[PDB]
């Protein structure tokens, strides 16, 4: 039993809710919240900008030190940093950004990072300003992630479409 509430069950291990991931993280304080990161951990907009704003920019400060030490992430890669006031840990995962021409096949590699964590609160990777089809992202998620993932979808209209079209 865990504290996630109001989710629709899609599969044995994948759950989905129309929710703001920031508010969901603030209430649940999950062990892991996933950020929709880029390789530079520049949290300007989308999910990343919202999560970072909720940490009062502490996420960005920590991220800048990480990059200064380690260099950029790979597309499809991840790193574990602090969850600040939102979660114990933040798993920063880089899905391909279609608006930069990155290969969508890397979306599966991105979701594989979730398997290193037993339970996660997450957005749909490569959705929103990353330009991929969210229906496709949900399919890759279900077909790749084997650990327990609680997906937060900000847009109510998109949430309903994702549920109604789910196979």
From Swiss-Prot:
Activity modulation notes: Inhibited in vitro by GRL-0617.
Reactions listed under catalytic activity: Thiol-dependent hydrolysis of ester, thioester, amide, peptide and isopeptide bonds formed by the C-terminal Gly of ubiquitin (a 76-residue protein attached to proteins as an intracellular targeting signal)
Impact upon substituting residue 31 to A: In strain: Mu/B.1.621
All residue ranges annotated as the Macro domain in the record: 1-167
Compartment(s) of residence: Host endoplasmic reticulum membrane
Membrane topology, as annotated: Multi-pass membrane protein
Domain of life: Viruses
Assembly notes: May form homohexamers. Interacts with N protein.
Free-text function comment from the UniProt entry: Responsible for the cleavages located at the N-terminus of the replicase polyprotein. Participates together with nsp4 in the assembly of virally-induced cytoplasmic double-membrane vesicles necessary for viral replication. Antagonizes innate immune induction of type I interferon by blocking the phosphorylation, dimerization and subsequent nuclear translocation of host IRF3. Also prevents host NF-kappa-B signaling. In addition, PL-PRO possesses a deubiquitinating/deISGylating activity and processes both 'Lys-48'- and 'Lys-63'-linked polyubiquitin chains from cellular substrates.
Protein name in the entry: Papain-like protease nsp3
Full-protein interval shown: 1025 to 1191 of 7096
């Amino acid at each position: 039993v865990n504290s996630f509430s109001g989710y629709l069950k899609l599969t044995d291990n994948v759950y989905i809710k129309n929710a703001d991931i920031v508010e969901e993280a603030k209430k649940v304080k999950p062990t892991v919240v996933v950020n929709a990161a880029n390789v530079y951990l520049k949290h300007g907009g989308g999910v990343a900008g919202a999560l970072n704003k909720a940490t009062n920019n502490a996420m960005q400060v920590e991220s800048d030190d990480y990059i200064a030490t380690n260099g950029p992430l790979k597309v499809g890669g991840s790193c574990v940093l602090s969850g600040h006031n939102l979660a114990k840990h933040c798993l920063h995962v880089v899905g391909p950004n279609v608006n930069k021409g990155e290969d969508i096949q890397l979306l599966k590699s991105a979701y594989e990072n979730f398997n290193q964590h037993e339970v996660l609160l997450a957005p749909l990777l490569s959705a929103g300003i990353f330009g991929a089809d969210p229906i496709h992202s949900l399919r890759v998620c279900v077909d790749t992630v084997r650990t327990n993932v609680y997906l937060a979808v900000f847009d109510k209209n998109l949430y309903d479409k994702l549920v109604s079209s789910f196979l």
